[model samples]
Target: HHMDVFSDRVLLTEESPIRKLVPFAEMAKKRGVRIHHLNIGQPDLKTPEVFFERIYENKPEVVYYSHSAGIWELREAFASYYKRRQRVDVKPENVLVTNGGSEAILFSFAVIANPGDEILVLEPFYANYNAFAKIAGVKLIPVTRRMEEGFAIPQNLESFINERTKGIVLSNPCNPTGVVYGKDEMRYLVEIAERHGLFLIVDEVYSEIVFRGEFASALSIESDKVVVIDSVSKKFSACGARVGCLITRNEELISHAMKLAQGRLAPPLLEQIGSVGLLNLDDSFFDFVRETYRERVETVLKKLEEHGLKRFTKPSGAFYITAELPVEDAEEFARWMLTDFNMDGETTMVAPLRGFYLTPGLGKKEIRIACVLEKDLLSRAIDVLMEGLKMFCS
Candidate 1:
């Protein structure tokens, strides 16, 4: 009964149930095989120690919830940081901090759309967006994006527009594909939103993780038409901090969102304080992270080719990748690796590409892999995948 309470339009995004991974790990334990975790984005980097020191040194007598909008100090810090880094101007009053980018996303979607109303999403979007859309009672209008087109925005976004279309969500330096949206893509999308009077939602969590040069934020557009969700999770390697902000120029929407926010009152105080430090990270930190992920990506790509495989356009920025494997069905191939194959005591976990595709019967031969570990670990993972694919094909 509880499950049935969800509306029929509740198209919750389903992850390839991770319970399956446990068995693989168990098999690895039984077989003395090492495991390489490439199925999810969990970077093995040092989170800043300075913030933890601050929390420990300032162990206060009491912990309290903050204002629903966020601590004013952190909000101001975010404003200053964005202006310094991305040349976008925002006020603390206009920003609402949330537990994570995920919450910020839910709030943004909830505020902008209605039941049966639709949002235009580029296909193979970050999987979580589908879950959020379902919770927000919004429909997704997916436009197929091909790697051959450099994964750029479609030229004819008008085709996805409908009477019920209410918004467009663009994930910059998009996950799973890592293709950064170009300035031209941004301009065209803005134009589409303008023509159809649809809100544009841009998630920039990985804004700074980009290995490719500079990135433009739709937040910089500074119009009532855009709502931006961003965070320090990926950019500053502070995923556990759960610090994110929602920014928009629309006063009405801001007020409404604030009203909803008031119910919760505020994000975690210590983490909010910690996130402020993220705004002040040194340039060396960014450089170190970029170099690490770049190397990891290279390791995967080189190994993939050595095994006689190709991938979608090399991910331009994000650390995740979409590889077009030799297997006939990525889902079957993925399952076989977990349940059957263990190469020299190692197994690989991957996300099947079909769920990422919006078109019927697409992505059957692909998989999304996140190179989120050290080189040795990622290399071994790739090797396991190579062996698994071979066995599956055989």
Candidate 2:
């Protein structure tokens, strides 16, 4: 019998650039050198003690499934967190828990667009957006922005609208660029969504991680059009916890998203128990983390400037910096850092920027550096990167 079976959509998905660098990392490790990881955003900060405490306190003899929409306790806790910290009043009924922000994106797309519809995304967006959009059977159309302008949302964003465009998806204090959307930009997006009657999917996982300036939330707009995706991964250094929420004021969207949630049965029960405890944490905890990240960002920029790799966006929030290097191909240079270059028995690993862009040949000379290490380790990483760049360029 001759039979072939495959979904082209899965085949169309490209390997994640962040994971693609792992082979280089393994090769580097085999050489017995310390590799400074500046590629991914896995933070080194201490997760709050309360999370662990709750886990111990709520220890169940038999772990049970939570409600598909999530545990009421976690939902209410997070809703109260928003009311207290974000100055926005969100109700428990408005939040649906997911496996992570990753699943939240997929659910948002599924709820907003039918198969073959399109979602407008700002270029150099989160690399995973392409995968999630593809998974949901929706097309992602890019609206390009310039690195010279610090990757800000384009001023004339309305021009990107089309008949098939169903929604807009963006990250605040974005993933690779680390540009915190200002109040003006937030308002602009809200206006566009309102006028077009399009859903606005806002990824706000890094909302509490900002080091400078005031951060704005889509919930501030007082509209049902905005949908927020949040996670504990970055906020509490709880990436392994794998807990996040999709929030909206729209009852219709929540009603539909809950069905998707039910299909998955339930989110991780233990993680939600811990996350509920995270909501009760004090501002002092964030103060300590924010100050540490602030110092780390400043150190990263100073070292990059000192090393003469000066062209890059000045990151205001999020723990990433997408910088233009002196090399023609950032991916090649990045691999060279791991394979052929080392400084004092150390090397640096960075994420090539090409995967983050939708337009071909863009970001070929750029890389995204995640500043999640402590100041001292980050300084050492910068030194390794600088030496690697010099050797590669020569």
Candidate 3:
């Protein structure tokens, strides 16, 4: 015990099983298998032309460390963007430009919850939430969302509250399940946050990609307790840009978060400079992207049904879907598909959903499909998936 080195802070976090099949897939590739990837959520679309244009033309003579909260131009762009797109009022002072939505999660945990404090989260959360929770020394208590009931928020969230509870966090139009939380559910949480005097950190990274129902921002509620994490990665197809914002009207929270921002010596200047263009993109740009993903979601679902696999809650938004696979152990099935199964020099890879849940022994037979590829490619991937499942079972 005396020789032990690493702290529990990092020792508590999980190695993401989302990419667990990568090593096997790499081997499969060397063996000349064309792997159809449906694993990660990285977008395949073209980033808007303006992002590139802004970077090329506006490259600073010296890439100075931007203003700690973000460069004024990009922060102002975010304020203007909120007013125009989400129909909310936000000022540059209220925006904290982050490396990505991921940093915003980190900052929120640091600013809001204390070590050994608990934050209630809907289960099957974005896996990185666990990573951030560990880093911040926060415990994520799960209010498990049932796939059968369409991952609905429970009407009475009060049962989960206690002396140690700090706040609640959830992704609207969530990551893997893709259920766009309804207005009723949103208001219920807002009411709970109000009554319980708790913060609500809403991840709206998929705000631009709703196919059915509306995408509501907690910002619209005008609650100081509400903080939103948003990103340009998915919206502008600019994942590598590594730019996003933590937007809230809470002055104290913003002031405290600036400490973390300044600690990092400002976010990367070029990415922040480039993201101003992304934030200022026209509503029509999101419309185009939404329709593109809508079509792809349809193609994927249709292909899955045609292949006689149909056990999933229909995802309303986000480019991901979690399906209950026929296999008992989905991780092994995913691994076997990559390592042992292939057809005509091709195979498919998927993220086992068990890692996405905070609760152990759940999602053992599920996998998340990142519908980030073209319709033809997604269809082909599902084709390979169905074939692989058959081969895996046999």
Strongest candidate by lDDT: 2
Show the colliding residue pairs in model 3. none
Provide the TM-score for each candidate, comma-separated: 0.93, 0.97, 0.97
lDDT of 3 by residue, 25-97 (tens): 8999999999888999989998888887899999889989888899999999989988898888999999999
Tens digit of lDDT per residue, candidate 2, span 1-394?
Answer: 9867678898776787667779988988998989888898899888888999999999989888999989999999889988988889899999998998999999999999998999999988998898899889999999998988778788778887888899999999898888898888898899899999999999999888787689989998889899999998998899999899999999999999988998899999999999999988899988887788888989999999888877888887888988998888999888888888888888999999999998999999999999889899999898888887887756
lDDT, candidate 1, 1-394, per-residue tens: 3554654654344445344456656765676666677887766788888668767766667788888889888889888877887788888877888888888888878887887789889888887788888878778888888877777677777887878888898788898788887676787788778888988888888887777756888877667888888887887778888889888878888888887788777888899877777777777877888888889898988888899885655777888888787767777777777677787767888877777766778888878888888898888888878878777866
Residue ranges of candidate 1 with Cα displaced over 4 Å: 1-27
Lowest lDDT 10-mer window, candidate 1? 10-19
Rank ordering of all candidates by lDDT, starting from the highest? 2, 3, 1
Q: In order, what is each prediction's RMSD in angstroms?
A: 2.3, 1.3, 1.4
The TM-score of predicted model 1 comes to: 0.93
> With candidate 3 superimposed using the best TM-score fit, by how many Å does residue 149's alpha carbon deviate from the native?
0.7
Q: What RMSD value applies to candidate 2?
A: 1.3
